[PDB]
Structures are given as structure tokens and as C-alpha cells.
């Protein structure tokens, strides 16, 4: 039912809409107005994906695919069987994600903590909306969004990437990839450091934050601190997602050619554009 310590926190108030209409729990889950909304949307979306499985003709979970409308439909509606189910599922998913963020706001708010978590979830929501809503609308058709399938949206990724050659040459792409790799590195180092401090050589006393700073300063020579590492983690993840959204919003919209052709500008800069030798020329 309740954690040993949970009861002193289960108080009324701190909710955006609906007073105490839905200000109650179902098991551990806090419900709220936006919890009601998000349960509705999630349930409807999962059901409509199952109905897509029925219409398509497979029950293999890895072959179920809900394709967006084809290019000729433009930005209008499509029949449910050939593109409309995708649109309804997209609306359901957007509503579910937004309601989840607002429910998180309500919970953060009943507990008296900052709103960093719904903040950071909004970044992922905006990346999803970039892929599904902003770019296809800016670009003319719902057919540029990805299908809802486990292995068929990877086909969308591959086709979109190879439309512009090697997508590795997108520069915002490189920045986003560097942020992702740095984020994974920092997460591994942080988890390892805290665990090694709390679980020392075996039977000797528990370590202190001073030991963590000492270890990492011995390793490379500059410890960032606990507050520093948590700030850096939030910012690395958010920067990665932001640059992903940027690299995809500019693709097919202001850049239409091979991306190495973008990299071509530095090579042609006046004070080396003509020299013989090297890779280029």
C-alpha cells in the first residue's frame, strides 16, 4: 500500500485543475485530472495499434506497422485504413505525453519540489513533435513522418538518412552525437563513483564526498562536484535532444543536397581554396 514514510506526504492541494475531484490515488499512482486524461489517451492509442494489427493482417508484434498517409494526401485527412489511424494515434500520443507532463507538474507541486522533471520531459516531447508534426507540416505532407512499427520506423530512419547521402556529415548531427556519447560516459562514471564510495573495499568504512573528489582529481585532475555532475547530466541530455531536433528541422527544409557538400565551404575558403596537394585538390 504505502511506503513506511509516505503517509505524512499524502496531503490535499497542489493541483492545477479540478480541486479534489481526482485528487486521489489508485494504488501507488496519483490520478488527478491529467492522470484521467493520460490514461484515456494511452488506452485509446494502444487499442488503435491493436486494431491496426487486425486490419494489416499480422499478429507478430515486430511486424505490426501503422503507416502515415501517403504523399498525395498532403496535409489533409486519409481513410482510417490507409493513413487515418496513424493520425488518430498521433493525436492520442501527443495528448498522452502532454497530460503526463502536466500530471508530473501536479505531483512535483504537491511535494514541494522544483519542476525540473516536467521541464526535461518537454524537451523529448518537442523532439517527437519535430519528427511527427513540425517537419512534415513545414515540408508538405504527413508522409514524411515515421510509421509506428518496431522495425519499420528504422526503415524510415534509414531512408531519410540516405536521401542526403551519409547523414554523418550533418554538423548539428555531429554535435548531438557528441553530446549523447558524453552523456553515456558521464552516467557510467557517476554511477561507478557513487557506488564505489558507498561500497568500499570490503569491510572497511564507508567513504565520503572528499574521497570522490580525491579519486577523480587523482584520475584526471579536476573534480566537478555533486551539484556539478547533476547539472552537467541534465544539460548534456537536454543539449543532445535539442541538437537532434535542430539537425532534423533543418534537413530537407533549408538543406536539400549531400551534407558533405555543406562541409565543402570550409575547403573553398579564400586563403587555401587553390593550393595543390592534400586530400582536396
Amino acid at each position: 500500500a504505502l511506503l513506511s514514510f509516505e503517509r505524512k506526504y499524502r496531503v490535499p492541494g497542489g493541483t492545477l485543475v479540478g480541486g479534489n475531484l481526482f485528487d486521489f490515488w489508485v494504488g501507488p499512482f496519483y490520478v488527478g485530472f491529467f492522470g484521467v486524461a493520460t490514461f484515456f489517451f494511452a488506452a485509446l492509442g494502444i487499442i488503435l495499434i491493436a486494431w491496426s494489427a487486425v486490419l494489416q493482417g499480422t499478429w507478430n508484434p515486430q511486424l505490426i506497422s501503422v503507416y502515415p498517409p501517403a504523399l498525395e494526401y498532403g496535409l489533409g485527412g486519409a481513410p482510417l485504413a490507409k493513413g487515418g489511424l496513424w493520425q488518430i494515434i498521433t493525436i492520442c500520443a501527443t495528448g498522452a505525453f502532454v497530460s503526463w507532463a502536466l500530471r508530473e507538474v501536479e505531483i512535483c507541486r504537491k511535494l514541494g519540489i522544483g519542476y525540473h522533471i516536467p521541464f526535461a520531459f518537454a524537451f523529448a516531447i518537442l523532439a517527437y513533435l519535430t519528427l511527427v508534426l513540425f517537419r512534415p507540416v513545414m515540408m508538405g505532407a504527413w508522409g514524411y513522418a515515421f510509421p509506428y512499427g518496431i522495425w519499420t520506423h528504422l526503415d524510415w530512419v534509414s531512408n531519410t538518412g540516405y536521401t542526403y547521402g551519409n547523414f554523418h556529415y550533418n554538423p548539428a548531427h555531429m554535435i548531438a552525437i557528441s553530446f549523447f556519447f558524453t552523456n553515456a560516459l558521464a552516467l557510467a562514471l557517476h554511477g561507478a563513483l557513487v557506488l564505489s564510495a558507498a561500497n568500499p573495499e570490503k569491510g572497511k568504512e564507508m567513504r565520503t564526498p572528499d574521497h570522490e573528489d580525491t579519486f577523480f582529481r587523482d584520475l584526471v585532475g579536476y573534480s566537478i562536484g555533486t551539484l556539478g555532475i547533476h547539472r552537467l547530466g541534465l544539460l548534456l541530455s537536454l543539449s543532445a535532444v535539442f541538437f537532434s531536433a535542430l539537425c532534423m528541422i533543418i534537413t530537407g527544409t533549408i538543406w536539400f543536397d549531400q551534407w558533405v557538400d555543406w562541409w565543402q565551404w570550409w575547403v573553398k575558403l579564400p586563403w587555401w581554396a587553390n593550393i595543390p596537394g592534400g586530400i582536396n585538390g
Binding site: 475531484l21 486494431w51 486490419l55 482510417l80
Partner: protein, 54 residues
Amino acid sequence: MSKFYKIWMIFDPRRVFVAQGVFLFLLAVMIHLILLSTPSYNWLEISAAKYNRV
């Protein structure tokens, strides 16, 4: 069947009614969308074939 009423000594009416309303609306939307998906029972397309809208 006579004493099914004691379910309300088990369940709080407020939570049950909220859940029931959500469930009923979701089920109705389910069935309407299923009907709209099939070429028949998609009453829209059927009436458009009746009155020559295409």
C-alpha cells in the same frame, strides 16, 4: 443478484464512477472507430455512395 448492492460497502462510489465514465467513453470511441475503419459500416462513405458525392 439481490445483494449485489454490498459492492458499495467494498468500493468508494467516487472512484468507481470516475473509472466507469472513463471506461464507457473509451469503449464507445473504440467501437465507433472500428465501425468507421471498415469500408462497410463506415456510414460516411456509405451515404456518400448513396447520394453520389464521389
